[PDB]
Amino acid sequence: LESKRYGEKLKEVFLMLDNNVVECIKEITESSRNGKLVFFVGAGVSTLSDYPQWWRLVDKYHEELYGSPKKGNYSSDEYLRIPQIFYNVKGEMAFDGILKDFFQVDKPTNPIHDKILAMNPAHVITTNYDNLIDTACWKRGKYFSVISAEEDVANATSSRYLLKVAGDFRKGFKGENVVLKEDDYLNYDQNYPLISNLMKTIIATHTIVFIGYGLGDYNINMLLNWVRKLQKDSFHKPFFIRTDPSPIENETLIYYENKGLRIIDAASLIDSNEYDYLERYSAVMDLLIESQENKFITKDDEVIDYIYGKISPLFALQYIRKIDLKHVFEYDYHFEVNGTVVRHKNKGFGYMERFFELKESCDERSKLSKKQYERFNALFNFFEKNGVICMAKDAGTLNTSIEINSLAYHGKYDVMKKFIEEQSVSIEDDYKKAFFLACLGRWEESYDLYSNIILNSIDESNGCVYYLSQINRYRIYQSITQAVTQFNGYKPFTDEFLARIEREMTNFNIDDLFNGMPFEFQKKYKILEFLSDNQFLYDDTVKLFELTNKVGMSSDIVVLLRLYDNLRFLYENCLWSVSFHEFHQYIRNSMSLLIEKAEYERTRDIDGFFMEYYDFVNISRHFKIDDIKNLERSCSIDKIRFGEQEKIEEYLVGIAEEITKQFSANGMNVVFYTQFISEAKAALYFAKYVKLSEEGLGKIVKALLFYFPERDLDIGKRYVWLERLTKCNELPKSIISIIDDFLVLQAEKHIDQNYSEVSSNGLYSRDYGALIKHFEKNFISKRLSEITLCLTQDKQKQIDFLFKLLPLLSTNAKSHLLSFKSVENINDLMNGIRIGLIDEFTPEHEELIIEYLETRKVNYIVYMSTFGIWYFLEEINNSKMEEFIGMDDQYDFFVDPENFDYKKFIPSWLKNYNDKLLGKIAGNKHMKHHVIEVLKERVKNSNDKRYLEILMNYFI
Amino acid sequence: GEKLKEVFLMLDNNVVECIKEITESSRNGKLVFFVGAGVSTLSDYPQWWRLVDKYHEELYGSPKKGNYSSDEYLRIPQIFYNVKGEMAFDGILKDFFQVDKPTNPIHDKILAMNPAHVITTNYDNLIDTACWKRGKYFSVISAEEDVANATSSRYLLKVAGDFRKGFKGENVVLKEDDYLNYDQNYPLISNLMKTIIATHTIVFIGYGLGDYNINMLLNWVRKLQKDSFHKPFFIRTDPSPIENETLIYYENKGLRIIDAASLIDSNEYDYLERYSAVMDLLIESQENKFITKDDEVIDYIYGKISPLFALQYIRKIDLKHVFEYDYHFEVNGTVVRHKNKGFGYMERFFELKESCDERSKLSKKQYERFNALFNFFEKNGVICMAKDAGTLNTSIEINSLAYHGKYDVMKKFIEEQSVSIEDDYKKAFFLACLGRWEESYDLYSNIILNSIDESNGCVYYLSQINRYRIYQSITQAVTQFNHYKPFTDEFLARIEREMTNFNIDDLFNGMPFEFQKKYKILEFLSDNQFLYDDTVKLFELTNKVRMSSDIVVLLRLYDNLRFLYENCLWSVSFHEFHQYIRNSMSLLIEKAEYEGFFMEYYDFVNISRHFKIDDIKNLERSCSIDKIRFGEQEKIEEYLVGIAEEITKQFSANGMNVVFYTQFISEAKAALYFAKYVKLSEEGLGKIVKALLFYFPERDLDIGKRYVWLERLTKCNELPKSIISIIDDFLVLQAEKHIDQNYSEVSSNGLYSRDYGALIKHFEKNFISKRLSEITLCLTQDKQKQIDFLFKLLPLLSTNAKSHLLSFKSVENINDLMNGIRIGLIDEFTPEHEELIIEYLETRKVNYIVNDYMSTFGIWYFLEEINNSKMEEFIGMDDQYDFFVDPENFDYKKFIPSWLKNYNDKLLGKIAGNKHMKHHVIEVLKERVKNSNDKRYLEILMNYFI
């Protein structure tokens, strides 16, 4: 109501203002924004809080000295001599008693004591000897180190000095702690030598505003005398706020403006009464505050100039996140991840709304100055590149697609190398090369290049490429230090280099990296202060909590877009913090929680989340095989599907091609190797869910099982990867040839007798042959057959290994191998030599195993589980079956099943049985309900998962 | 390397304290290196004696035997300037000083100490080049016109001038005239130099004890007060050792002379050796040090924990940050060394624990410090070093009346007068937990105002943060409140005028530089870095498990709760912490099923305050909390009794606080719903049931949800006589409220007050209600709504009440027909009930051409009670009914795989006995248990179908 009227009054006052006062306000606001504003409030400020004046105390001194008050008024000297006459004649204790009974009072702070601190002054120099400004600072939440005496100058903890040049009363209401009289003003430079120098240092290095003074004060003229001693242009002219009832005469204005003061009169700027001081004090102060709050921005040239002044620093950076953009305009607007802007704290003009109004209409944009037109063009290009498209009120359709156009993210190691081995056009060109060297391993060269960038950019404006290079040098140093903490302590780095980085990065304080910047990289780029901190994704990891709660931007889309923004900020701006454990943990948690939340919503069918190329790259880079396995044993990835299968295929091919460039060619790069092999393992493991072309699967499989390292992927892991790949494709014959080539290579490596495949899952070359047969039963491995035909009798390792691959051979090959059969096998057909030599259990086998089972009767009444499985599968069929009853429990279970006691049937057999056998036990009469009941009793009173995957899969 | 610590051993007491102060100032960013001409000489920069001799050579013959005096050092250049001119002076300056000397290592040892400023008396560029090479930005200030235009806060202040504006005699202070009117030509440079000298630690290097600059500086320091200034740290590296009389003379003049000739035996020309000796001493002293004896283990640890004595409890995660990541204080009480490459002070300290032989050697003041440190480590739960011990007793105990729900003792503390600011700090948080946010904000502001002396500053910072969070709570409430608005608009004006432009991220950065060093762990309370480590561990452990992991989650959660509730921080009542508690406890309880989690009193209060009813239902569906016991069931019972008494005091005793209500009604509802799992005494049962059925407001718990809560209560506690009487009183109250024709049970799930009669009967089957029967015998035949109520409670009435009621109420509507099915005395289905079902079906057909019971009519048709084959002619849209009356036509794809949860034993057995529906239902249940984690479907599968 009345506040709005006061705002309109301030607006029209600013509109009807000369260029001198608006320039004074502009400089005061720019000092308040650079953190260089220092207020020099005086006695007039505290009087508005009704604090006792000094004419009252000099009146008391005159009344207690001469018996009566003054016959008129006191001059400047009589304000300093009558207290001195009282001190010299009466004494000290009476002086302090009067000071106590006049100054012990407690008065509340006036609103101007809060308007003063609302401008965020660097220091507050005060001539007041009262704790009113101390009270305002303490209530406001700003710790201003109070410096009352010279014992406080050295003991001033913080760098925010609340300097009381006249003294204070915190050490008692005595005259020795304040400057009040003669012999205390004459003796000020020899009783107060350290706050005088501190006041004269704050004044010379900052911007000074004199608030509560008249242009006749001792504490104004003594400073005007000191600046007269100074040189010309050696110091900034201090600002002076004048709030006297009468307007300033032009002669006095000229006199005090040539003396050093930039007077901002209030009686010549507002209309008020003689005794209305709080109106004048709260007029110019309100003018500065509302100017800082952007309440006086009217022209579209000032709209463009404000946004340009806040954004055009960030032109050096290749991407700025929406969170960073919010931090730019002091939380006035919320730039959302989808690109819509909403006003949050802007209490002044809508400069962003006006900017987008200029964007939509070309005719109003033409109604602008040419320089401001080009500034608008620059801002428009910036905002359309970063994704800020318009306000939410005017938001219509908007596609949220990400584009991280950095060669480091997309793989592209060969293009990265080609870019590295070139001539650097500029320093920002060398910054990309340094980050790229860090990406593909060469951390020594990356550290050296970052040092060179720092050296060349020490003396250079807009020092992002200096600051960011220092940060990435400290992070590549941390990466080297951690590399030789866990890989050592092969040999990645030399010892001369390590000593050099420890002799260079000895006391590099990353905390003080931002505070060591030249005060322009403190305001223009305060959005980059978060990079020097050790942890910077804490505002994002706790946003993942909105994902895990169970009951146009939901929680799913906003965290994925914020993940993309963090990814596009580190990869496009080439920041090495993208490889640390914090960012890897962030990506892991965010993608895992996104997939888990999608699975939770999908499983609410009791009453999604397609992932594109940029998601596949993240689950290949920042995930591990265990983490993807943890997602596999939970979320149904078979439904979360995949998109952009052409770019995922080229990603996997570039990963597969680099695999056959690091093992086929001479690639050690052991620090690059550990990261890249994790990426390759995760990518080729996650490639089960993407459809690949014939040549795509051809190159990837050929990499997987010819050029992948043996140590990282054994033959079992290679088979698991291969089977996961062959699920989705149909395994074209060009790739079955590749698997056959692997088998012939392993057979030829088995020519050397002292060789044995080491597998971690027990899954071997026989199962590669099984995969070949189970997609193509009509297949004869020709080269394997040539090995069979030209194989000697005494090459035992080849004999057994290539026996394990019998179906893949010809009939002549089979007979050449079976030239060394066994007929002494007591049961040696499936102990280690199980391939499928069974086919028909002829009496050459059947009767001989029956003789062995007679020997087993001899061993029992005075190898079995396979007899039971074999007979129940009708593989043994003879009248000699029901001879040797009374043997092991499983014999009674399988051989005489319609009389068996299934209570003795051990529960764990079904966990180690054969799946086709469980399929056969499903269809029968008695074993049907008995395995039903034993498996049900396992489901209730036991704690595993094997029994549940049999009851529900087979039977019913 | 080791010779440096040998020198450390040989250091005198006066030297070893000087290095400690210098290193401390370097770590506090208060070091300023006053470099001189003895350091640039190590680079072989042309000394002024060569140029004085050159001025002598071009003007005064050639040499001057005697090496000149200081007056002769400053007069021959002045005589040359006066007579031979200025251009010749500048020409000789250009001939000598335009050189490219390489920077000596001391230039890099100075900047390796991280000096705040560098006040050089040299006119050279070697320190500028050293800063440029190292990577330090120093705003070089050579002239007066650069003081105001200083780019950075760090100053490379060249007091004597510099040749960066040309090799001229005007830009430097070299002659006698330049040294006489120096303060007339350089006022701002002098003021800056004196301000830096007064407000920093000056470490003069490269000077002699003569050195006119040093003499003028000491003369100026003489004019200062007695102990106003700090004493500068002169580094003397002259060849001869300093005479003791000279050191006495200069030490009383201001300088703290660190000698080098009395520090290392070197030649008469090994200046680099002495400079490097002192500089390397300082640099190697930066890394911890000063901790060799047992009386220094109790001052370095007391130098990092004695601030933390005002905090009532701190986290072990915070304890890791306290000791600069030297040790990783684990949550079970072990202290794993992480980056303590120097002396093992934790090991030594825990060795001085017990072991009275070691403690007796310790000094008496160090003994009190050790007792304080031991009490601190005992209170916070730190036991000892990692490899030592291992028993590691659990059970963190949060002692706070806010956590335990003591809403009456908190009021007592609030009402009583307080004797300390920390008592008001507890009182303000107690007010905040009690809803009274206005008095909370006012008392917090009073604490900030009255924390003036308070040299710790942790009762001002925590109160400022808590006032910010209570202001956020008030603003978010009045935003959400749009009940009533409890805060007067004057209060909103006060909180939005005082607490505007107050950013919480500027509070810590702006504190005393001591408070930013000690109480550093308090800086996470502003932003969300407070939970960052614990949230990361929670996410990683949620991925992993699905000193053992389950214990790691629990102990970290209890650490976070004991940091917030015991320190009385309002950050506990915010969203992020609530989600942290909820996710951690959900992870623990889910981990229990994979195994076991005992669950204690401290768990029950956590799953009541921070969980919601929806999350409770999620945990009950997914996992099983039934077999998971709840340990201490007497402290849980007192908690539930306190909650019942609080809702009683809130509703039946008129006075209620809406801001307190909004927080407490989300916890009372959760605890009384989670009270199923705890055994409750008859007294506690009666209290919380008579507070649930009568005093819980109907806007937050209607009849149906009240009944859900009540059936949950009567599972582990049965339904005794006193609770039966309570439910009877509830039914009586409902009857006298339903005497009015405009009253109706508004239920959100469909379990009306008839179900309460069913619950009473289910545990009794013979509870004749005397008062309800008395209510029945007032039949006026116009008070229908009442007759219908007691019709729904017909089994609860007596034989006379049944006789009077059934003489008026009969079966003439579908609703009272299904009510008759529920209450009984229908059983036999005479044709009128079947055709009544058909009439309801007709009224449904009227909608069909264009709250459902067609499901239970399909149920009845499957249950072979009704047999009218015309019901198939009225096949509708509810596919339960299509399933039940036409199994073959019903496609089971549209069968929502719910509806099996709410089926009885007999009906599920009936679906078991029909081929098509049976096999389709195995398919449905199978896919349900593979995709969904609910166990009810699995129970159905192997109770009726497997």
Residue numbers in the entry:
A (entry chain B): 6 to 494, 504 to 565, 577 to 632, 644 to 898, 912 to 1005
B (entry chain A): 12 to 493, 503 to 566, 578 to 626, 644 to 898, 910 to 1005
What does the paper say about this structure?
DSR2, a Sir2 domain-containing protein, protects bacteria from phage infection by hydrolyzing NAD+. The enzymatic activity of DSR2 is triggered by the SPR phage tail tube protein (TTP), while suppressed by the SPbeta phage-encoded DSAD1 protein, enabling phages to evade the host defense. The protomer structure of DSR2 revealed an architecture that consists of an N-terminal Sir2 domain (residues 1–298) and a long C-terminal helical region (residues 299–1005). The Sir2 domains of two side-by-side DSR2 dimers contact each other to assemble into a head-to-head rod-shaped homo-tetramer of DSR2.
The gel filtration profile shows that the DSR2 tends to form large oligomers. To further investigate the mechanism of DSR2 oligomerization and NAD+ binding, we collected the cryo-EM dataset of DSR2 H171A catalytically inactive mutant, and determined the cryo-EM structure of DSR2 (H171A) to overall 3.18 Å resolution. The resolution of central part of DSR2 structure is better than 3 Å, and that of the very C-terminal region is relatively poor due to the dynamic property which was indicated by the local resolution maps and 3D variability analysis. The overall structure, especially the two ends, undergoes continuous motion. Local refinement focused on the C-terminus of DSR2 improved the resolution, which allowed us to construct the atomic model and precisely assign the sidechain orientations, assisted by AlphaFold2 predicted model. Interestingly, the two side-by-side DSR2 molecules form an asymmetric dimer, with the one cavity at DSR2 C-terminus closed while the other partially opened. Comparing these two cavities, we observed the structures of the C-terminal domains of two DSR2 protomers are distinct. The C-terminal domain with opened cavity rotates upward and thus moves away from the cavity center compared to the closed one. Additionally, a long helix in R1 of the HEAT repeat domain of one DSR2 protomer with a partially opened cavity directly contacts the C-terminal domain from the other protomer, which facilitates the closure of its C-terminal cavity. The interface 1 consists of the contacts between the last two α-helices from the C-terminal domains of two adjacent DSR2 molecules. This interface is primarily maintained through hydrophobic interactions, wherein the hydrophobic side chains of I981, V988, L997, L1000, M1001, and L1005 from two DSR2 protomers form extensive hydrophobic interactions with one another.
